[PDB]
């Protein structure tokens, strides 16, 4: 039939980047029309692939990863990059073949009081390997002393909220991101 792409974009809700969502698109033909109606100005950045290859996927298997980060960080959802989203949250390989879709969602994902519902991992001992997902909440030990199950001095609950408000700058504003990959 038709690929369920209106459920990737125009999903009722998007996940935190630390818990990025993967949905398989397996055996269908694609229409990306929904992208014009959600995002007036979006971005469709493909590496090593024509985006016309993402039009026929009747005999191909595609991974759609989706999350919300902020605009300064969309540059980290790209091959060979470093930051806190690439290092600790979502890591693309250096040989990446696929596409990265991004668009401003300040109108759905910001609140005058502040939307604290989206989180990113701030602390980790090692960097994430490509396409890895760490959804743990175990306290991080930044010091030489054990943390004993509790945050405090040099002991950090590893996830932090994003503080998204409409008065923020285009940089500091929530962006929805969708990474298309091949299996």
């Amino acid at each position: 039939n038709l690929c369920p792409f209106d459920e990737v974009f125009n999903a009722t809700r998007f996940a935190s980047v630390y818990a990025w969502n993967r949905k398989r698109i397996s055996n269908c033909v694609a229409d990306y029309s929904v992208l014009y109606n959600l995002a007036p100005f979006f971005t469709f950045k493909c590496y090593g692939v024509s985006p016309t290859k993402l039009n026929d996927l009747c005999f191909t298997n595609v991974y759609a990863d989706s999350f919300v980060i902020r605009g300064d960080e969309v540059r980290q959802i790209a091959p060979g990059q470093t930051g806190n989203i690439a290092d600790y949250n979502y890591k693309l390989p250096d040989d990446f073949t696929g596409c990265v879709i991004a668009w401003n969602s300040n109108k759905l994902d910001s609140k005058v009081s502040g939307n604290y519902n989206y989180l990113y991992r701030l602390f980790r001992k090692s960097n994430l390997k490509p396409f890895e997902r760490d959804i743990s909440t175990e306290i991080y030990q930044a010091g030489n002393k054990p943390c004993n199950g509790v945050a405090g001095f040099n002991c950090y609950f590893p996830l932090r909220s994003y503080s998204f408000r409409p008065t923020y700058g285009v940089g500091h504003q929530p962006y929805r991101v969708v990474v298309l990959s091949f299996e």
């Epitope: 818990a19 519902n117 989180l119 959804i135 909440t137 175990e138 909220s161």
Partner: single-chain antibody, 232 residues
Amino acid sequence: VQLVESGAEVKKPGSSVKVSCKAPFSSYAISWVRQAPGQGLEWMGGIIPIFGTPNYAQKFQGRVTITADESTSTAYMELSSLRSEDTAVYYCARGYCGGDCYSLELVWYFDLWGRGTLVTVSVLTQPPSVSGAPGQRVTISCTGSSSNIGAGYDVQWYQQLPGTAPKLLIYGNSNRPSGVPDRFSGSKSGTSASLAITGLQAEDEADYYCQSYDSSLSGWVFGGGTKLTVLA
């Protein structure tokens, strides 16, 4: 705040119960778990209110229907075609995800448990029994698989004293909630996890259950339960 459930029921074999559960919750996960008399906790299923499709354990797939009504602020479990086996206590549990719950997979802990709705109808491995020396250290093992503990999911531990609902003891793998003394510790390595109690006290004598997410069955799973007994 405390989850308030409907009253006990005596049902004939073949009937259906609809158990209510109210927060006196759109950001939280509702999870339904039962405990047949003398047995461990069983996960029945769960829903994310408003934005969720209900998720069920394969044991209960065609017999259970988990609903949530936003207006009335109540969550419902309807178990149909009852047998004698379904006699148990039915608990509802609220799960925190820090803010809003995308899915039932991302629940950090089920901190607020209900009452018990007792319905009478006319896997992770744990030591069934552990004996401990007072003032000394005991450990309770939780051993899982590469579909759960070893898939990168965290272990929670729960305490059940006689007559009450489980109480959250450690979430994370090792994190103590507020109120839980330092004597309790948690640890996770590979496909196994461990609760430790130091300076054992007669009050620590209770049942302990571990819990994790399993991605191959796409739900929560409980351990068999451990009856810790404090010696003299």
